[PDB]
Amino acid sequence: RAFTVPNIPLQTLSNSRFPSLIQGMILSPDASQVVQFQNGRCLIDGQLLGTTPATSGQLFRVRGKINQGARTLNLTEVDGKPFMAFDSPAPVGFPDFGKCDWHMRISKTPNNTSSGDPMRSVSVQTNVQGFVPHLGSIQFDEVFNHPTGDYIGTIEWISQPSTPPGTDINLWEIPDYGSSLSQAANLAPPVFPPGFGEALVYFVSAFPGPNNRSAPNDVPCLLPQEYITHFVSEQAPTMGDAALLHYVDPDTNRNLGEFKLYPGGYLTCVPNGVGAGPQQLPLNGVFLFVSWVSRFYQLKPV
Amino acid sequence: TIEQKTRAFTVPNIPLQTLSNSRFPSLIQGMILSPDASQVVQFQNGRCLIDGQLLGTTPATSGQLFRVRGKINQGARTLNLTEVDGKPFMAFDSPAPVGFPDFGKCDWHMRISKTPNNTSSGDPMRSVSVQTNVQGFVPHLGSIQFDEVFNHPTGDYIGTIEWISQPSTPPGTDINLWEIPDYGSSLSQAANLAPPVFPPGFGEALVYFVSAFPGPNNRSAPNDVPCLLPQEYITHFVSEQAPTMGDAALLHYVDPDTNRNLGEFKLYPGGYLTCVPNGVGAGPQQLPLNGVFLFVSWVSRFYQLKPVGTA
Numbered sequence: 001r002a003f004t005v006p007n008i009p010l011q012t013l014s015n016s017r018f019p020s021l022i023q024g025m026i027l028s029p030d031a032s033q034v035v036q037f038q039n040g041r042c043l044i045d046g047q048l049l050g051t052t053p054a055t056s057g058q059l060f061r062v063r064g065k066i067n068q069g070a071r072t073l074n075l076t077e078v079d080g081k082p083f084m085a086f087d088s089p090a091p092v093g094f095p096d097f098g099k100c101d102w103h104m105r106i107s108k109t110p111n112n113t114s115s116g117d118p119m120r121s122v123s124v125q126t127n128v129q130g131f132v133p134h135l136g137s138i139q140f141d142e143v144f145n146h147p148t149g150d151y152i153g154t155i156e157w158i159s160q161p162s163t164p165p166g167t168d169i170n171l172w173e174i175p176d177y178g179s180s181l182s183q184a185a186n187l188a189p190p191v192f193p194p195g196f197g198e199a200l201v202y203f204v205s206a207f208p209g210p211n212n213r214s215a216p217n218d219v220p221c222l223l224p225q226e227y228i229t230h231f232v233s234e235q236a237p238t239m240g241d242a243a244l245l246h247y248v249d250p251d252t253n254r255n256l257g258e259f260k261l262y263p264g265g266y267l268t269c270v271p272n273g274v275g276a277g278p279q280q281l282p283l284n285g286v287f288l289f290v291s292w293v294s295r296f297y298q299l300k301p302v
Numbered sequence: 303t304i305e306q307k308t309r310a311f312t313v314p315n316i317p318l319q320t321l322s323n324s325r326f327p328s329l330i331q332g333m334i335l336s337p338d339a340s341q342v343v344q345f346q347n348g349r350c351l352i353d354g355q356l357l358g359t360t361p362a363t364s365g366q367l368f369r370v371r372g373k374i375n376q377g378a379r380t381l382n383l384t385e386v387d388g389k390p391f392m393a394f395d396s397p398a399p400v401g402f403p404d405f406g407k408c409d410w411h412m413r414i415s416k417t418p419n420n421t422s423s424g425d426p427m428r429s430v431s432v433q434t435n436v437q438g439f440v441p442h443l444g445s446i447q448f449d450e451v452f453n454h455p456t457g458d459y460i461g462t463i464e465w466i467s468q469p470s471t472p473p474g475t476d477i478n479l480w481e482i483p484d485y486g487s488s489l490s491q492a493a494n495l496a497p498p499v500f501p502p503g504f505g506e507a508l509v510y511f512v513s514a515f516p517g518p519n520n521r522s523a524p525n526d527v528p529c530l531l532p533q534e535y536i537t538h539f540v541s542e543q544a545p546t547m548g549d550a551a552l553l554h555y556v557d558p559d560t561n562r563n564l565g566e567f568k569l570y571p572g573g574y575l576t577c578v579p580n581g582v583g584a585g586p587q588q589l590p591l592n593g594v595f596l597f598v599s600w601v602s603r604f605y606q607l608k609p610v611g612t613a
């Protein structure tokens with residue numbers, strides 16, 4: 001099977017850390033930034049990593065059982081199937097937003113009622129002892145004084161982490177999935193700055209909530225979700241050190257820049273000095289696979 | 303190019319249980335037939351020709367699906383709609399902004415927030431309610447009306463429907479997710495609505511993919527939202543733009559464990575699937591959800607399907 005990427009403009013594609021349109025393409029503000037996102041991780045031959053779902057349907061959802069008067073949500077997969085702990089860091093699609101407090105909205109499922117607002121607000125801190133999704137559970141800030149059941153929902157907005165007090169949201173980081181006695185199994189590995197003039201490319205979307213900068217909370221990810229779905233469906237074997245892509249303006253067929261898509265499921269480019277980079281490019285372009293290339297291929301600067 | 307005009311038709315090679323609803327972002331939880339065998343549908347989302355032509359308000363991807371954005375003044379009840387990216391909604395061109403919800407015959411309970419964030423603390427979320435059969439529900443004309451005065455700062459608000467309930471009027475009537483809302487007014491009909499989809503007859507019945515949406519109803523049952531196509535199918539067709547080479551695409555719903563065909567379906571170019579129920583009570587709801595639809599061949603519209611399920 002010949003390798004391809006989706007023929008859809010970037011601005012129409014989706015973030016792979018939460019369902020939303022991509023709103024920007026950037027380099028990390030810190031050139032030394034290492035990332036270890038658990039969602040939006042897929043080998044370009046269609047092998048999912050970490051907690052990454054094949055599609056957006058499963059992405060950024062939380063499901064579990066909770067008892068009336070408890071603080072603990074005992075996680076399942078999003079479809080209600082048991083979560084097999086000690087295999088994965090968390091259920092498939094579980095949020096990977098580190099260094100923030102989560103303000104979630106959940107409801108008891110399925111509906112078995114003829115009236116009533118089913119929505120419940122709960123808050124989750126990610127650096128506390130009770131945040132142990134790898135062990136199958138997360139702890140809410142307050143006792144859950146609502147009916148026992150199977151609850152499903154998502155993070156509605158985020159805010160600064162409660163501890164250490166005064167620290168800001170940092171969406172470049174992931175939460176601590178493991179416990180004091182056990183580290184999380186099968187975490188998607190870290191992705192390091194490639195060096196040799198190359199820099200990692202991140203796709204960003206804004207997420208609701210405050211921060212210390214009184215600015216949008218921007219969520220970086222490594223791949224559009226549609227790319228992941230495409231790779232899972234296509235299962236095209238990787239035949240080079242990297243896939244060479246052109247970012248093409250579909251209005252003119254003009255090549256706006258060269259990028260490498262590595263087998264590990266991330267993109268790089270070579271910025272043409274400070275001030276240059278993919279953030280200078282329009283967001284209506286389409287990536288096009290050109291050729292497999294070796295490790296000795298030097299990208300033309302963007 | 304030659305390659306473009308000869309590009310072979312394909313569908314995504316992913317099990318159904320992993321695919322997504324095209325009326326709101328959620329995994330597909332089942333396949334059903336409409337309870338009324340004469341049910342005509344006219345959903346505005348999840349509408350795409352199999353050569354990749356989008357219809358109604360259908361977005362190419364899930365990123366735009368089931369979102370609402372607009373401007374509202376403090377002390378007003380009117381949300382002046384824009385596209386999800388903030389750009390103006392060109393009214394009279396479409397029934398509503400791309401991705402705008404098409405849930406008819408229910409009250410909408412929405413959650414919205416002012417965008418972009420310009421705060422260092424505080425819960426930005428606001429609850430508003432929208433009735434869809436009132437004179438103020440005119441998305442085609444560029445606006446919808448909240449039930450209550452909006453006593454929050456004037457600005458650009460984005461959000462979605464969080465849960466639904468029975469329509470307020472006529473009092474006592476139930477949610478009916480088979481229906482779409484009236485997008486226009488009595489003096490102005492909605493332009494460029496995706497056309498209705500009719501039962502094929504002659505033994506064939508339309509197939510719907512369902513996902514539960516939060517909220518009550520008169521039956522104390524899940525609010526199952528039916529759609530015609532998985533969203534991944536729509537994205538695939540938009541990307542591929544494979545030419546339609548026959549009246550219908552014959553699909554087999556194949557068990558990934560045994561490679562056995564569990565059911566024959568026809569995917570029509572208008573962007574919907576049919577099957578032949580194997581008697582009263584039989585249908586695709588009897589099939590497991592881990593099957594994969596595989597494209598077999600182009601066939602004529604007169605091609606007869608092996609009946610699916612058991613009576």
Ligand SMILES: CC(=O)N[C@@H]1[C@@H](O[C@@H]2O[C@H](CO)[C@H](O)[C@H](O[C@H]3O[C@H](CO)[C@H](O)[C@H](O)[C@H]3NC(C)=O)[C@H]2O[C@@H]2O[C@@H](C)[C@@H](O)[C@@H](O)[C@@H]2O)[C@H](O)[C@@H](CO)O[C@H]1O
Nearest residue numbers: 101102103123141158159160161162163165166423424425
């Ligand atoms: C330190 C403490 O427990 N203070 C209690 C008060 O609770 C705090 O009130 C703040 C406004 O005055 C604010 O709402 C705090 O929460 C927000 O800010 C923090 C930043 O550190 C986090 O970003 C939170 O996620 C965010 N939450 C919301 C909903 O906006 C709030 O502190 C939070 O809640 C308390 C109860 C505790 O769990 C903290 O760990 C948590 O950060 C409270 O208003 C007051 C009256 O009950 O009591 C104070 O002791």
Ligand SMILES: CC(=O)N[C@@H]1[C@@H](O[C@@H]2O[C@H](CO)[C@H](O)[C@H](O[C@H]3O[C@H](CO)[C@H](O)[C@H](O)[C@H]3NC(C)=O)[C@H]2O[C@@H]2O[C@@H](C)[C@@H](O)[C@@H](O)[C@@H]2O)[C@H](O)[C@@H](CO)O[C@H]1O
Nearest residue numbers: 115116117409410411431449466467468469470471473474
């Ligand atoms: C008829 C009327 O206006 N009654 C007023 C009270 O409002 C109603 O209260 C009900 C509970 O006793 C219930 O919450 C009604 O709303 C729910 O049910 C209807 C169907 O019957 C719809 O499904 C609504 O969407 C649903 N809403 C919620 C939040 O669950 C409620 O009527 C609704 O709200 C009022 C204000 C009005 O806008 C109605 O059009 C709407 O249906 C109200 O509580 C009371 C003041 O406190 O005044 C009563 O006259």
Ligand code: NA
Nearest residue numbers: 131176177178
């Ligand atoms: Na932990």
Ligand code: NA
Nearest residue numbers: 439484485486
């Ligand atoms: Na109307």
